[PDB]
Design a protein around this nucleic acid. Sequence first.
RNA 1: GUGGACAACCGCGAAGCUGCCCCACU
Lengths: 235, 55
Amino acid sequence: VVGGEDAKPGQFPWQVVLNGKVDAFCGGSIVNEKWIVTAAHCVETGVKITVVAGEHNIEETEHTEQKRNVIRIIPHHNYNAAINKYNHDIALLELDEPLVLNSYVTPICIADKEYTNIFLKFGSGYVSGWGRVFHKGRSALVLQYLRVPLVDRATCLRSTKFTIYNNMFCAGFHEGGRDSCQGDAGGPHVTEVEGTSFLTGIISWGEECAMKGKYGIYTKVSRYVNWIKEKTKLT
Amino acid sequence: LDVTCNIKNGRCEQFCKNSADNKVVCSCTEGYRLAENQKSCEPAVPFPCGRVSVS
RNA sequence: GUGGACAACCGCGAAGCUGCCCCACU
Ligand SMILES: [Ca+2]
Ligand SMILES: [Mg+2]
């Protein structure tokens, strides 16, 4: 996340990092002990994925970490980047062993269709991840977070060439050096209400992060909450 | 002065719902419960979602 | 204006329906 800040050790306990052939290639959010939610384009290629919760610095060891192996990947059945890059960019990962919930490893709240959208319409969410600290840069050492204002789909469309489907939404700044980047993808866009955080978005493609007059594009969680809850249902 | 969900979320912390009567009924997300005041949400488990407990 | 792609002083109605608001003709 460019133009962000360092998250304090357990500030976003729902954040997870994805590791494969390369470390820190995508983010994710804890749904429950056995299920993570990420972006579909983070998991199209069939590499054995590894999930790490209770992370803070990816180069050091804090003894709060929990590694798990993904044993099932459910990309949203309508996702296809050949057709459209951004639309339906969401997926679920089932873990081998349950995470054990504690202060550093805690799920993100997922409201219903209606309230997820209300919370989105507040107009300011928290995005985070160990992505690029600059447009062209290395992965972030410590977890990065940035507060991103929701942007009108008309004004976003007039800026970015892309059509914004009802499953998508834009957030960030016009003439800024503030935005999520590659690596942050699959991570949480989260709105906080009375000191409780709700999953309002999934971080999508982030190449060419903070170009003048280009907002960040995020997957609108409100539209997928039923599906999430259905598939991640424990027992 | 009659309360409904479409003003200040019926003073519900998380979730509002209207009733057939002139009352609203507040609720909370999983792992929270309704407080004594029937408005606020408090934890009902060691580690409820969306909560930071480190500082 | 015409053709194609797409919740707005919160329009219809429980599963969505409508289309005030980019592209080619200007
Ligand atoms: Ca580490
Ligand atoms: Mg429609």
